[PDB]
Design a protein around this ligand. Structure first.
Ligand SMILES: N#Cc1cc(Cl)cc(Oc2cc(OCc3n[nH]c4nc(N)ccc34)ccc2Cl)c1
Lengths: 404, 558
């Protein structure tokens, strides 16, 4: 029997456009959907279904096979009561603590469970033709679709059974599921961890379900960094108070009053000014201050998570996850044949998975790129089964270096 | 006419909504007559059916006579059933571009006849299509009917008809893979590389197959001849082009003539390389009347003429060879004016086009060039399913310098430089670190929000000094002034220190064009300098001569 799904009140189906796709991604999708049709997972549909969700094709994580990825972001927002304030999956505080965390695809589980007859239509997607020569091929799901956050919420009960054994016998292994994936944490030796993950896929395999190694406890600081130099210049100090003055009001108890005094009247920038010691007691008081966390910054389960990324150069990208600006829950960097978009794409996924590991939810990305460029390109480098929320922006000159 | 043996589409009314009950206005006898004739026929044909007064739905009818002729026309105003009908999937979301068409041996156009009427309407919806032919006045209860087929002008007819025709063709397309069938509105476009033998025959198997389905197309002889005059285009067997652009010689130009013009011109751009519309468009700004006469600016006249030239002969485009590749060439026309041409074989263009857009308030040619590359890339995906290899008037080393040091991410697909001027470059770069033995200008700007009175100035480290009074400014404008000041009086190499993240940001970007004339003079300046270092500091924090320019510009302003 099926579970009854109902769109959040006062709203209805997604009417999201289909981005145009290339010939190769189109055949890849045509083939795939024919098989899913034979296997009866998705059935063709009529004009009478106004709904629509984009669909694309990816080549997974270092794979030669084409995977079809469905952009259910709109739909997930419209059914959010169901999968969150109803059939919610509690997130394990433990997970971020493990020396090792493996991520396993569990998305094929859904293909068993049927999708409530009344909800199906919401799942429409189109396989567009080239040069609009023909009508796109329209489909609708008959089973739990992967990418829809209703699936795990529903499937939750059947995963509990699938996992009760492994759990009874491994009380210190943390098992989390965020959408299509399973996150398995353990403090075991790596060989031991790998062995249990394998022992885990055996269990999974008896129910039909057919890793990728994270090291949470090793995710550290991106402490704002002040330079150490012999011979300063008006510039560096100017730049010094600049960065310094900015880190304050975000870093509780900074100090510059000394430094400023070295910069008095109007001298050239190229001017070397030695340092007084009290001023040095300042870099240190501050420098020391920077190594240590924020204080007063706590994740608010009810608030959205934000991630901003700054292009630093030479394959380096910096980023910060926060809920209130300058109230960073987390900062870091990502470093690299890899163009800017390829790199930015990979940053976006890395951060997103950390985000999932720690808080159990994805951040809304503020990407330093053109909506267009990004829109046309990302799917070339995309390999996750989820897609986070994104918005485009222009980095504020000062932010890039204050973060360098 | 046949009324399709096929399955029907479930049609529902919008939620919490009920069918229409609009009252029939009373008609003249001539029209009540007219309608009677018309209706009995539609009923004779199966097209409509007679209901009772138990069915409560109503949609107003109207008969319209003729322009020249003496024929009557039934007009049903489905505005309410439409406002109560569900929403359907979008018909076709884009229209084939000729240049995306693969050359075919023979192409035949089959226009379905009386499409909407050739297709059933969901039985349970029919009741909503209720309409009434009023009796002579109030006396006598009207005649009630209801549609059996898709009524004209109703929300779903375009959609459903489209679907039905997809379902009808499915088969044929299976046991006929090499035949191309373009579906457009109520037309069928068919082409194959068969010898006119099996082609002229395969066309008939289709027509017959269409007939098993209620669909009547025209037979040969009544089948159109090439060049097909489709959709604004001229589709010949080995080429395609736009339909005759007739640029009107006129004495006076009205807003409306200019508009119609720019239109014709823009449509011509799909294949007439190097069409410009910037000067012409410019005239449109501020818009007076539709009938108002604009005087052709000189540039405007010069554009108009460069245009007449390009059109003074005829250009045609080729079709698509999926084996050969796609090359896209872009050239800088003028002020934020780009022109591109796509071809597979050097110089035998598939299509052309232009890009002008102002993406931002200040910008440069490298930033524009990539905007055009993006616009073309997408456009290629749409038409051909793949992106072109590009040949840009930008040097590989310029691109890379820019790409590398830019705050935002950028990525151009395969490309090659091509020495076809004007060439794309950066007209100035800011130093990475302070010039030694160059003057340090500590600039500043203030503006009282009350009086909109501003003060722009500098205080250098060679004790020099200045301050200017501005009258209707903002801080942004005073801070840009201060910098222009410092540029103006400083010579070949400076060092400028501002506290304007805004001016910083603006300039760090290497703009080369701007919507602001202030930003334009500054640009002009920076382009002259041999070395310019520009740095920032917080304001209202006793820094260098920052406070020194503060008291200067604040004195009176704040
Ligand atoms: N009217 C009309 C019209 C509108 C469209 Cl979008 C398509 C169309 O057909 C084709 C047009 C094609 O173009 C290349 C071609 N081969 N032979 C031709 N003969 C013509 N008279 C016109 C174009 C072609 C190829 C296949 C096809 Cl089916 C006809």
């Amino acid at each position: 029997e099926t579970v009854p799904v109902k769109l959040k009140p006062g709203m209805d189906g997604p009417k999201v456009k289909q981005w145009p796709l290339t010939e190769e991604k189109i055949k890849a999708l045509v083939e795939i959907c024919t098989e899913m049709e034979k296997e009866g997972k998705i059935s063709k549909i009529g004009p009478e279904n106004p709904y629509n969700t984009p669909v694309f094709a990816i080549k997974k994580k270092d794979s030669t096979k084409w995977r079809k990825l469905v952009d259910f972001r709109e739909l997930n927002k419209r059914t959010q009561d169901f999968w969150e304030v109803q059939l919610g999956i509690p997130h394990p505080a433990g997970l971020k603590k493990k020396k090792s965390v493996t991520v396993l695809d569990v998305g094929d589980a859904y293909f068993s469970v049927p999708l409530d007859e009344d909800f199906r239509k919401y799942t429409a997607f189109t396989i567009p033709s080239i040069n609009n020569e023909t009508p796109g091929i329209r489909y609708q799901y008959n089973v739990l679709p992967q990418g829809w956050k209703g699936s795990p919420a529903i499937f939750q009960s059947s995963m509990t059974k699938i996992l009760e054994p492994f759990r009874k016998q491994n009380p210190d292994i943390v098992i989390c599921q965020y959408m299509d994936d399973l996150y398995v944490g353990s403090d075991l030796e790596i060989g031991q961890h790998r062995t249990k993950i394998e022992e885990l896929r055996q269990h999974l395999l008896r129910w039909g379900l057919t890793g990728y190694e994270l090291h949470p406890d090793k995710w550290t600081v991106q402490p704002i960094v002040l330079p150490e130099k012999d011979s300063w210049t008006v510039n560096d100090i100017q730049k010094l108070v600049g960065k310094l003055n900015w880190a304050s009001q975000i870093y509780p108890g900074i100090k510059v009053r000394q430094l400023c005094k070295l910069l008095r009247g109007t001298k050239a920038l190229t001017e070397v000014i030695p340092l007084t010691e009290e001023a040095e007691l300042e870099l240190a008081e501050n420098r020391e201050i920077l190594k240590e966390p924020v204080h007063g910054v706590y994740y608010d389960p009810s608030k959205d998570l934000i991630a901003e990324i700054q292009k630093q150069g030479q394959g380096q990208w910096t980023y910060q996850i926060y809920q209130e600006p300058f109230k960073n829950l987390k900062t870091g960097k990502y470093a690299r044949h890899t163009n800017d978009v390829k790199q930015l794409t990979e940053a976006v996924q890395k951060i997103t998975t950390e985000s999932i590991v720690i808080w159990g939810k994805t951040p809304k990305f503020k990407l330093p790129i053109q909506k267009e460029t990004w829109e046309t390109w990302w799917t070339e480098y995309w390999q996750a089964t989820w897609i986070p929320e994104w918005e485009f922006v222009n980095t504020p000159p000062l932010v890039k270096l204050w973060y360098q | 006419s046949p009324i399709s043996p096929i399955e029907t589409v479930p049609v529902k009314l919008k939620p919490g909504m009920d069918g229409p009950k609009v009252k029939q206005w009373p008609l003249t006898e001539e029209k009540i007559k007219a309608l009677v004739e018309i209706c009995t026929e539609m009923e004779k044909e199966g097209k409509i059916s007679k209901i009772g007064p138990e069915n409560p739905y109503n949609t107003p009818v109207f008969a319209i006579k003729k322009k020249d002729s003496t024929k009557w026309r039934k007009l049903v105003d489905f505005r309410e059933l439409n406002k109560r009908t569900q929403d359907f999937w979008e018909v076709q979301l884009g229209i084939p571009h000729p240049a995306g068409l693969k050359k075919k041996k023979s192409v035949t156009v089959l226009d379905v006849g009386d499409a909407y009427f050739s297709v059933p309407l969901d039985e349970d919806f029919r009741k909503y299509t209720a309409f009434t032919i009023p009796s002579i006045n109030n006396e006598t209860p009207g005649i009630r009917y209801q549609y059996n087929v898709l009524p004209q002008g109703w929300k779903g007819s375009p959609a459903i008809f489209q679907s039905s025709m997809t379902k009808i063709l499915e088969p044929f397309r299976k046991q006929n893979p090499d035949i191309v069938i373009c579906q457009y509105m109520d037309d069928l476009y068919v082409g194959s590389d068969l010898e006119i033998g099996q082609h002229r025959t395969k066309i008939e198997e289709l027509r017959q197959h269409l007939l098993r389905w209620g669909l009547t197309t025209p037979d040969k002889k009544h089948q159109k001849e090439p060049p097909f005059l489709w959709m604004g285009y001229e589709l010949h067997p080995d080429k395609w082009t736009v339909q005759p652009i007739v640029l009107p010689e006129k004495d006076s130009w009205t807003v409306n003539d200019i508009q119609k013009l720019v239109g014709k011109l823009n449509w011509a751009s799909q294949i007439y390389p190097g069409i410009k519309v910037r000067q012409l468009c410019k005239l449109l700004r501020g818009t007076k009347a539709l009938t108002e006469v604009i005087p052709l600016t000189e540039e405007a006249e010069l554009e108009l003429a460069e245009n007449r030239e390009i059109l003074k002969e005829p250009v045609h485009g080729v079709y698509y060879d999926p084996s050969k590749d796609l090359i896209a060439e872009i050239q800088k026309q003028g002020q934020g004016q780009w022109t591109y041409q796509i071809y597979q074989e050097p110089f035998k263009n598939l299509k052309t086009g232009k890009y002008a857009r102002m993406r931002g308030a200040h910008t440069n040619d490298v930033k524009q060039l990539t905007e055009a590359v993006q616009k073309i890339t997408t456009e290629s995906i749409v038409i051909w399913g793949k992106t072109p290899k590009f040949k840009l008037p930008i040097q590989k080393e310029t691109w890379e310098t820019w790409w590398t040091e830019y705050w935002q991410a950028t990525w151009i697909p395969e490309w090659e430089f091509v020495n076809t001027p004007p060439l794309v470059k950066l007209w100035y770069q800011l130093e990475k670190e302070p010039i030694v033995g160059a003057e340090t200008f500590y600039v500043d700007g203030a503006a009282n929000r009350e009086t909109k009175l501003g003060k722009a100035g500098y205080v250098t480290n060679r004790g020099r000094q200045k301050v200017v009074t501005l009258t209707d400014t903002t801080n942004q404008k005073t801070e840009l002034q201060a910098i222009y000041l410092a540029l103006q009086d400083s010579g070949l190499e400076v060092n400028i220190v501002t506290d304007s993240q805004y001016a910083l940001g603006i300039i760090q970007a290497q703009p080369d064009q701007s919507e602001s004339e202030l930003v334009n003079q500054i640009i002009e300046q920076l382009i002259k300098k041999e070395k310019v270092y520009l740095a920032w500091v917080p304001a209202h924090k006793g820094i260098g001569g920052n406070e020194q320019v503060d008291k200067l510009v604040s004195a009176g302003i704040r």
